[PDB]
Amino acid sequence: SVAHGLAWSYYIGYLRLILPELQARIRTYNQHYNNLLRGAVSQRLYILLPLDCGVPDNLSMADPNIRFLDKLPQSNSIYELLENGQRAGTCVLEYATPLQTLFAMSQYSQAGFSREDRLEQAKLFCQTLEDILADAPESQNNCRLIAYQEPADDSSFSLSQEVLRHLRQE
Amino acid sequence: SVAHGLAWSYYIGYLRLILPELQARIRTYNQHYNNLLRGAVSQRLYILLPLDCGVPDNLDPNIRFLDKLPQSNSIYELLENGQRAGTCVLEYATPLQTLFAMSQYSQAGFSREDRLEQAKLFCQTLEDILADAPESQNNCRLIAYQEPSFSLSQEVLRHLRQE
Ligand SMILES: COc1ccc([C@@H]2[C@@H](C(=O)O)c3ccccc3C(=O)N2c2ccc(C(C)(C)C)cc2)cc1
Ligand SMILES: COc1ccc([C@@H]2[C@@H](C(=O)O)c3ccccc3C(=O)N2c2ccc(C(C)(C)C)cc2)cc1
Numbered sequence: 510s511v512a513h514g515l516a517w518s519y520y521i522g523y524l525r526l527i528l529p530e531l532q533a534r535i536r537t538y539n540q541h542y543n544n545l546l547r548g549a550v551s552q553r554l555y556i557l558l559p560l561d562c563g564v565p566d567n568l569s570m571a572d573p574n575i576r577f578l579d580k581l582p583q584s585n586s587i588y589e590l591l592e593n594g595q596r597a598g599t600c601v602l603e604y605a606t607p608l609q610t611l612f613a614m615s616q617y618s619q620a621g622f623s624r625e626d627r628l629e630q631a632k633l634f635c636q637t638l639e640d641i642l643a644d645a646p647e648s649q650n651n652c653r654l655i656a657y658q659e660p661a662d663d664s665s666f667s668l669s670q671e672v673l674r675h676l677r678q679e
Numbered sequence: 680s681v682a683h684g685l686a687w688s689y690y691i692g693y694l695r696l697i698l699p700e701l702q703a704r705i706r707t708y709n710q711h712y713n714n715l716l717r718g719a720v721s722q723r724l725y726i727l728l729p730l731d732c733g734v735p736d737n738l739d740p741n742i743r744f745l746d747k748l749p750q751s752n753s754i755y756e757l758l759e760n761g762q763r764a765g766t767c768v769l770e771y772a773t774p775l776q777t778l779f780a781m782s783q784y785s786q787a788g789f790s791r792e793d794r795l796e797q798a799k800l801f802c803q804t805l806e807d808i809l810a811d812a813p814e815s816q817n818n819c820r821l822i823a824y825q826e827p828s829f830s831l832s833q834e835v836l837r838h839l840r841q842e
């Protein structure tokens with residue numbers, strides 16, 4: 510049942526506060542700070558929600574097709590996404606950082622929290638957060654959760670492709 | 680049921696990480712930075728848990744900021760009878776802000792009664808995690824309270840004297 514508190518704190522202490530000014534920050538960046546000869550940053554906050562709760566310290570180390578470009582002024586980061594070796598999209602991207610509690614609990618023997626318990630709580634965190642965001646006034650076509658289970662076959666999943674599928678739905 | 684996730688995250692993402700080096704940080708302060716007469720900073724981390732979930736933006740005239748704890752934690756002096764009666768590392772259990780904000784958000788369907796119950800369960804769950812945790816070695820004290828004038832300094836001093 511840890512997922513409920515994780516989802517509510519993440520929304521009420523972070524997403525609720527950053528989503529209202531996000532569009533204005535992206536528009537300011539695109540007009541005044543972005544380099545001339547490249548794409549504009551897309552408008553939504555893209556949140557990576559790996560169901561395995563594996564949150565890396567560097568997105569480029571997780572996928573070489575996701576490259577840091579800049580900080581979004583006014584901490585959020587802009588990345589370029591590659592496909593077939595070329596630039597395919599630019600967006601504000603980050604992980605659902607409360608998943609780190611679920612990961613750490615699965616590694617702490619006193620929690621009595623298995624990998625199966627972790628997966629169940631990650632799914633509940635995603636479901637609860639989606640329900641909150643659906644009813645939230647701050648979420649106005651400006652946030653997208655990217656929840657994913659990684660197949661056993663490495664070749665059948667690309668993190669950059671997962672973000673690109675959502676970005677192309679804009 | 681939000682209290683469980685709040686307690687586990689607060690422990691596993693913060694208390695578990697800061698409690699092992701806390702007493703060394705307090706010893707550094709007491710030996711090299713503390714210039715008060717018999718004002719050694721107490722050894723434990725004191726965590727304010729207002730059961731009403733009211734966390735102010737800056738931590739009572741009898742509680743006065745002294746310094747940042749080197750190596751963000753803050754040291755305060757506690758006054759009693761107008762004089763310094765103790766010094767400690769003091770801070771709020773910041774996850775209570777989720778419970779307060781939920782009670783202020785109609786779509787959460789979370790009443791003041793639900794809030795109080797979750798604040799008490801957060802305190803109990805956190806105390807139990809800390810009791811079984813290898814990082815809490817007589818170094819973290821939870822100060823849970825409710826208002827009846829209330830004196831926050833008197834609440835902290837009771838726990839300081841218990842150390
Ligand atoms: C003061 O006590 C805390 C406790 C936890 C957090 C963050 C923070 C986040 O960055 O998302 C968060 C917010 C809401 C719910 C859960 C978490 C969470 O899981 N945190 C966290 C938890 C664990 C980690 C390590 C295991 C990598 C160290 C890193 C980050 C921050 C302050
Ligand atoms: C990235 O997403 C987050 C979400 C929440 C937090 C912190 C953070 C804390 O400072 O204790 C925390 C950790 C673990 C569980 C809960 C909370 C929590 O309740 N937070 C919080 C929640 C709400 C507030 C306002 C309502 C005053 C703005 C302020 C702080 C930080 C990052």
Ligand SMILES: [Ca+2]
Nearest residue numbers: 660661662663
């Ligand atoms: Ca594999």
